[PDB]
Design a protein around this ligand. Structure first.
Ligand code: CHL
Ligand code: CHL
Ligand code: CHL
Ligand code: CHL
Ligand code: CHL
Ligand code: CLA
Ligand code: CLA
Ligand SMILES: CCCCCCCCCCCCCCCCCC(=O)OC[C@H](CO[C@@H]1O[C@H](CO)[C@H](O)[C@H](O)[C@H]1O)OC(=O)CCCCCCCCCCCCCCCCC
Ligand SMILES: CCCCCCCCCCCCCCCCCC(=O)OC[C@H](CO[C@@H]1O[C@H](CO)[C@H](O)[C@H](O)[C@H]1O)OC(=O)CCCCCCCCCCCCCCCCC
Ligand SMILES: CC1=C[C@H](O)CC(C)(C)[C@H]1/C=C/C(C)=C/C=C/C(C)=C/C=C/C=C(C)/C=C/C=C(C)/C=C/C1=C(C)C[C@H](O)CC1(C)C
Lengths: 50, 222, 34, 257, 221, 221, 60
């Protein structure tokens, strides 16, 4: 999946600047705080877990 | 008291269980201190004893030599400039007038760093080589550490009982010199001033001008 | 309210920890058969 | 003491010759598809890489098998040198190295019209090789003809090899036609009989892989008209966009929608 | 598991051609690492063994003590004068003096000489008792000089000799880890100039961007 | 006799009083153990192995620390950082680390890949050296030979003994030069080849005693 | 504003830890329970009459 999103064409990004389009992901977010933030987030409103 | 089983020890009255078995008060300076067992092997102990005595003797020479020029500078017996401080005497050889003994240009008046270095290599190289050899033109006893004979003009080692006790005096004055010399090295690095200037500052304000005044001098900064 | 939150976090963690280490205490061996 | 040993610590040397030699040797078809009694009897599991694979019944006796194995091992060793030598120089040029005649099927043309080649001692300095084409043809033919004749006649001149030091003509005697050893084994990796048997299996298996690979290099050259490195680099760059099917299309496929 | 000829060794599968003969597995933490032959002599090995355990127990206290005030300052309401371990010494020169937990009612030390005199008197007496093997009025007569027990084991966690052998491996291995990490605290203090907790929290912010090689390696030469 | 035995040369020329344990049985025995460090036969063995391994590493390092700089000074090749104490910083440059400057060679980009591969590669290599492995097992620890002597230059026992003395003497010289590179680099902050050029250009003015010695106390370099 | 509140609702905080004190509440409690559990594992297993070797545990 990450090879598809970074080297083979890319993944459709609905948030892409200029309108939703297929986009190459060049800076994946691998920060531990961001990853752990999603995993141990609440499942309730506003948080929604992952 | 300085030899045998009831000799003085590094921990005083509380040194019974701290003395290694191989330290039996047979040599000068045996306060039974070897918490690292570095002298457990008899052959390495003998070599370490020679290194200690040679170091102790250089330190006694060094401690006196690191203060004598500064004392003369203070009382006005001679002028050295910045060379009065022991850790600045080396650059003196690079002065336009040259290294003048006692500040007198009619004395050594050395100018060449190579000459003072090559001369020392030949002289000390010969002197040290004879010491390692254990034999030489001079007359000595069979002890390499304690030659006597030629190196004992005054017969102070002739009496054997006094010789054993004087040996303790040599190592004990020597060890104090080595500790003080380490103090000269560290104080020179930390304070940056001469040992006598360090002493004067401690006397001026003992509670403030002490080692902890420079305790924060080498704080690593981001 | 933080005092209340810390008290509840202490209480909830206590009962969950008992539940977790309770089943780690050779639970499967606690059966009447052989 | 031994000149052989394991690679992953003490007791890490586990050379199982049973999988490659004997009745339970692996076969080109699994157990449930091919019974071991359906294998040609001449393939008894004594030669390296005997997968029991010989449809068309080409090998009908030990002599025929021995003659063909002499051919297979030579075709395999040459393909291993070629496979490595056909793609390594091209990979250098594609990455910025100054190599004239990168693609293997275009190196010959580079020597035409008096042009020369650059030999790259890759770890270190490159070379502007002065040998002209006429000279290269003469030297290569002379050295290769002499080398092959020595192999054909099973005898050669005395010389020096590091493993054996200085040797005479006597060493050429008692050398296997396919596994000469001796001077040809300077590192002495053939000393252990169990290791030698296993390494023989790796030789033909890497060799058979190289032969099929060079066949692809040739077929690919005819179709795509590019060097093997260029085909690989662009398959990896855009796999679905650059493969055999896309090339065969040879047209801008209209969107289906 | 940890004793005898079948104990684990420091080079794993390759640790068999360099295990010294004198390293047999009779002492805790014996991974057969003496490649420089320093402990060839049994008497020197005995002393080196005490030095390691002592350096280890100080390191374990040091490792915890060097990070605990820094942890407590960031993740609690405590406000130390200097939470960073290599700046906590200068607290005694501050106007308010050294206040334990930042509370002026605790300790409130204000003279470095008085603390030093009390330390050399207390640590001097204590280290003498360990060295001599018996405290005041023969407090520790007969107890092991490295593993005393008795008064030093109030909870009796090492009454069973088999448990003792296992736990002595735990002590030396946590101790060796602490010693290795205290080396980290020293060098990271020299190079980064920040507290060890700050170094960790910086690694965790973005490990690729905030590490030794991406920040400081180029400056060291 | 010339290099082994009681008639061997000594570190102090005529004045020769070799320690008893030094009996000219091993290569490079000039009877120099004034500190008595190798009095223990087991420790001496361990020390001899350390010296040979250090010497072989030093010989590779000494040649490897001047080769990039010699090529750069002679304009033979361009390196991102030819000076040895700066070569490591090349990994953090823009295009990465290119061998000999040619972008088609190695072209490494991540220090983590270099570190992890070296950990695995050198971990196996050193394990093979001490426990034995693919190249052979049961071979001499310091002088395995076999695959490591393909040319057979050590086939003659006499030549092997003399060549072993040559290895240590070239190795010991390389070890001293490595200390020189480090100390000179830490002081001059310039590559060793550049430092040599300076001494040859004006030896009476760029010598250490005149250039830095006078500024080693109270004044910066 | 007129009143005070934690204002942590819908903020995506790890384990809902708005302040570091909650971390100590969870960590201390878990460590204590883990502490009493850890020093009792051998006794609990001893009741099985088997040793917790590679063949221990309910197995069909
Ligand atoms: C009665 C108690 C008594 C005590 C406690 C000591 C203690 C000591 N004696 Mg001793 N002695 C004692 C009685 C006697 N001695 C001697 C005769 C001798 C001799 C001849 C010698 C000693 C020596 C020593 C020292 C051993 C070396 C050392 O560093 O030790 C361990 C000590 C420490 C590890 C100190 C710990 C640090 C301390 C708290 C200071 C604080 C350090 C800094 C603040 C940290 C800064 C960090 C920065 C730089 C990063 C040591 C402190 C030796 C010496 O002089 O060593 C220097 C020595 O050669 N004693 C006699 C005559 C018979 C005694 C009679 O009672
Ligand atoms: C991070 C980016 C990075 C990049 C872009 C490169 C790029 C390169 N590296 Mg390098 N490296 C990189 C990082 C690193 N390298 C190394 C360690 C090395 C070494 C040790 C070597 C290189 C080499 C090379 C060059 C090889 C190309 C060549 O000349 O081939 C020429 C062609 C060939 C050698 C053969 C054909 C290659 C082509 C890929 C065919 C592949 C065929 C396979 C059958 C494919 C199989 C696929 C699988 C999935 C089935 C090349 C320019 C080599 C070199 O120096 O080149 C001269 C080399 O020997 N690198 C490390 C240290 C761990 C790195 C760390 O980051
Ligand atoms: C041994 C196998 C071998 C193979 C498979 C090829 C294959 C090829 N050669 Mg070639 N050559 C081979 C050996 C040799 N060639 C040459 C010298 C040349 C030249 C000079 C040329 C070729 C050319 C070619 C190509 C066109 C026909 C083709 C792909 C020609 C071509 O079109 O190359 C692009 C070409 O110009 N070859 C020499 C002597 C140096 C060879 C010696 O063994
Ligand atoms: C007397 C000179 C002589 C010379 C110069 C060569 C040279 C060569 N022979 Mg060769 N041979 C010679 C004699 C003989 N060979 C053989 C049997 C073989 C075989 C069976 C093979 C070679 C191969 C080779 C080539 C690679 C060898 C190799 O990897 O070596 C360095 C080793 C490392 C090479 C060009 C190989 C080849 O052509 O592979 C493509 C190969 O497979 N030779 C025999 C009979 C036993 C010889 C008798 O004199
Ligand atoms: C034996 C111990 C010894 C010690 C502790 C020192 C210590 C010192 N010497 Mg020194 N020296 C020593 C022996 C000798 N020096 C010199 C010749 C010099 C010179 C010419 C200079 C120093 C200087 C210095 C100081 C600065 C560092 C330096 O350049 O050192 C050099 C010393 C040894 C490498 C420093 C405090 C410098 C100084 O004082 O400048 C302010 C300086 O310029 N020394 C000679 C004769 C060649 C020595 C022995 O033979
Ligand atoms: C999880 C799937 C799986 C597993 C664990 C096994 C396991 C086994 N198979 Mg079996 N098999 C499978 C799937 C599987 N098979 C499928 C899908 C087919 C149809 C092609 C077969 C057809 C088959 C036959 C005809 C035989 C076995 C045999 C065997 C036994 C050993 C010999 C062997 O490996 O033969 C098979 C070897 C291969 C099929 C070579 C395939 C090449 C590689 C492994 C393909 C990998 C491609 C890639 C990873 C797939 C991507 C994932 C995909 C789902 C998208 C062995 C226990 C033999 C046996 O039972 O002995 C009596 C035997 O005769 N298998
Ligand atoms: C990497 C292995 C290796 C190495 C380093 C050498 C090195 C050498 N060989 Mg040798 N050789 C080798 C493998 C090797 N050979 C093998 C495998 C064979 C068998 C085919 C030979 C057969 C051989 C012969 C017949 C001769 C040499 C000769 C030589 C020497 C001169 C070669 C020359 O320039 O003129 C070529 C040289 C030192 C020559 C020599 O010995 O000098 C008198 C020579 O007569 N070699
Ligand atoms: C080994 C010992 C400790 C290992 C680290 C424990 C976690 C560090 C303290 C908790 C913390 O605040 O981390 C802070 C680090 C630093 O990362 C920051 O974190 C903040 C709060 O979590 C925010 O999420 C920020 O977005 C993020 O940048 O991020 C983590 O929470 C990762 C913790 C989980 C991984 C720990 C290592 C395994
Ligand atoms: C001697 C030590 C403690 C003696 C008993 C407590 C005396 C008052 C302590 C005041 C204090 O600073 O507490 C420190 C805090 C008290 O709590 C914090 O105190 C801060 C002031 O220091 C602020 O008032 C904060 O708001 C408050 O949360 O408690 C701790 O975090 C200590 C944790 C355990 C430390 C053990 C060290 C051994
Ligand atoms: C085994 C082997 C074998 C072979 O043969 C040889 C060889 C190699 C030699 C060997 C090895 C060795 C080693 C590794 C060593 C290391 C060590 C260390 C690191 C230590 C530390 C060590 C360290 C340590 C103790 C530490 C300590 C600390 C302490 C006390 C304390 C501190 C502190 C605190 C709390 C806080 C504050 O604020 C500050 C202070 C006050 C400061």
């Amino acid at each position: 999946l990450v090879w598809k999103a970074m080297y083979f064409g890319g993944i459709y990004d609905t948030w892409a600047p200029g309108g939703g389009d297929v986009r190459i992901i060049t800076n994946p977010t691998v920060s531990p705080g961001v990853i752990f933030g999603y995993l141990f987030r609440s499942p309730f409103g506003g948080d929604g877990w992952i | 008291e300085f030899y045998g089983p009831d000799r003085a020890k590094w921990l005083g009255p509380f040194s019974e269980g701290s003395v290694p078995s191989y330290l039996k008060g047979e040599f000068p300076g045996d306060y039974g201190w070897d918490t690292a067992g570095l002298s457990a092997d008899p052959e390495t102990f003998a070599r370490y004893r020679e290194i200690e005595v040679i170091h102790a003797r250089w330190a006694m020479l060094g401690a006196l030599g690191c203060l004598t020029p500064e004392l003369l500078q203070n009382n006005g017996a001679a002028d050295f400039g910045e060379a009065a401080v022991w850790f600045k005497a080396g650059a003196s050889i690079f002065n336009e007038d040259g290294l003048n003994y006692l500040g007198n240009p009619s004395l050594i008046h050395a100018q060449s760093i190579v000459a003072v270095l090559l001369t020392q290599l030949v002289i000390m190289g010969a002197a040290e080589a004879y010491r390692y050899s254990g034999e030489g033109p001079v007359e000595t006893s069979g002890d390499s550490l304690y030659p006597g004979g030629f190196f004992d003009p005054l017969g102070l080692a002739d009496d054997p009982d006094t010789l054993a006790e004087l040996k303790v005096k040599e190592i004990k004055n020597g060890r104090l010199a080595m500790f003080s010399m380490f103090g000269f090295f560290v104080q020179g690095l930390v304070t940056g001033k001469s040992p006598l200037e360090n002493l004067a500052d401690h006397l001026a304000e003992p509670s403030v001008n002490n080692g902890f005044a420079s305790a924060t001098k080498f704080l690593p900064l981001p | 309210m933080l005092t209340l939150k810390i008290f509840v976090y202490t209480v909830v963690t206590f009962f969950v920890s008992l539940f977790i280490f309770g089943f780690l205490s050779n639970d499967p061996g606690r059966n009447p058969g052989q | 003491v031994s000149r052989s040993g394991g690679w992953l610590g003490s007791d890490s040397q586990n050379i199982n010759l049973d999988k490659w030699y004997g009745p339970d040797r692996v076969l080109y078809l699994p157990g449930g598809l091919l019974a071991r009694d359906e294998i040609n009897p001449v393939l008894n599991g004594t030669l390296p890489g005997d997968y029991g694979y010989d449809p068309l019944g080409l090998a009908k006796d030990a002599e025929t098998l021995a003659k063909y194995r002499a051919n297979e091992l030579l075709h395999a060793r040459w393909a291993m040198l070629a496979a490595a030598g056909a793609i390594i120089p091209e990979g250098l040029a594609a990455n910025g190295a100054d190599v004239k005649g990168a693609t293997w099927f275009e190196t010959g043309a580079a020597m035409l019209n008096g042009g020369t080649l650059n030999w790259f001692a890759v770890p270190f300095v490159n070379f502007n090789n002065p040998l002209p084409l006429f000279a290269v043809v003469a030297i290569n033919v002379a050295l290769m003809a002499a080398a092959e004749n020595y192999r054909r006649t099973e005898d050669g001149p005395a010389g020096y090899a590091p493993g054996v030091g200085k040797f005479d003509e006597s060493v050429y005697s008692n050398m296997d036609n396919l596994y000469p050893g001796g001077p040809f084994d300077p590192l002495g990796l053939a000393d252990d009989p169990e290791v030698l048997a296993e390494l023989k299996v790796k030789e033909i298996k890497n060799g058979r892989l190289a032969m099929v690979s060079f066949l692809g290099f040739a077929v690919q050259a005819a179709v795509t008209g590019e060097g093997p490195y260029a085909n690989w680099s662009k398959h990896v760059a855009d796999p679905f966009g650059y493969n055999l099917l896309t090339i065969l299309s040879s047209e801008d496929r209209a969107a289906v929608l | 598991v940890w004793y005898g000829p079948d104990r684990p060794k420091f080079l794993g599968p390759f640790s068999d051609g360099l295990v010294p003969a004198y390293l047999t597995g009779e002492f805790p933490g014996d991974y057969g690492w003496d490649t420089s032959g320093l402990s060839a002599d049994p008497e020197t090995f005995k002393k080196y063994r005490t030095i390691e355990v002592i350096h280890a127990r100080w390191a374990m206290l040091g490792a915890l003590g060097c990070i605990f005030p820094e942890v407590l300052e960031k993740y609690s309401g405590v406000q130390f004068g200097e939470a960073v371990w290599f700046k906590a010494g200068a607290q005694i020169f501050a106007d308010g003096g050294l206040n334990y937990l930042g509370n002026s009612g605790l300790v409130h030390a204000q003279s470095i000489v008085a603390t030093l005199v009390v330390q050399v008197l207390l640590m001097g007496a204590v280290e003498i008792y360990r060295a001599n093997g018996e405290g005041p009025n023969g407090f520790g007569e007969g107890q092991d000089t490295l593993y005393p027990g008795g008064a030093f084991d109030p909870l009796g966690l090492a009454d069973d000799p088999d448990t003792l052998a296992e736990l002595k491996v735990k002590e030396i291995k946590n101790g060796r880890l602490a010693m290795l990490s205290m080396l980290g605290f020293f060098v990271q203090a020299i190079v980064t100039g920040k507290g060890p907790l700050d170094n960790l929290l910086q690694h965790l912010e973005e490990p690729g961007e905030f590490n030794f090689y991406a920040l400081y390696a180029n400056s060291l030469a | 006799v010339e290099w082994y035995g009681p008639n061997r040369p000594q570190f102090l020329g005529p004045f020769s009083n070799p320690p008893s344990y030094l009996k000219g049985e091993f290569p490079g025995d000039y009877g120099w153990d004034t500190a008595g460090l190798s009095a223990d036969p087991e420790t001496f063995a361990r020390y001899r192995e350390l010296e040979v391994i250090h010497a072989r590493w030093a010989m590779l390092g000494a040649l490897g620390c001047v080769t990039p700089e010699l090529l750069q000074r002679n304009g033979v090749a361009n390196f991102g950082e030819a000076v040895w104490f700066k070569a490591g910083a090349q990994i953090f440059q823009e295009g990465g680390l290119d061998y000999l400057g040619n972008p088609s060679l190695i072209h490494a980009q991540s220090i983590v890949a270099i570190l992890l591969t070296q950990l695995v590669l050198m971990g196996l290599i050193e394990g093979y050296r001490v426990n034995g492995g693919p190249a052979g097992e049961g071979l001499d620890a310091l002088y395995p030979g076999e695959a490591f002597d393909p040319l057979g230059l050590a086939d003659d026992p006499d030549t092997f003994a003399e060549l072993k003395v040559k290895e240590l003497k070239n190795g010991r010289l390389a070890m001293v030069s490595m200390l020189g590179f480090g100390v000179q680099g830490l002081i001059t902050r310039k590559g060793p080849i550049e430092n040599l050029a300076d001494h040859l250009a004006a030896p009476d003015a760029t010598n250490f005693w005149v250039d830095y010695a006078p500024k080693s106390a109270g004044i910066g370099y | 504003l007129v009143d005070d509140r934690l204002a942590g609702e819908g903020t995506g905080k790890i384990l809902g830890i708005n302040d570091p004190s909650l971390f100590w509440a969870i960590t201390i409690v878990f460590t204590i329970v883990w502490g009493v559990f850890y020093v009792s594992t051998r006794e609990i297993d001893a009741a099985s009459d088997r040793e917790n070797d590679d063949d221990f545990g309910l197995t069909l």
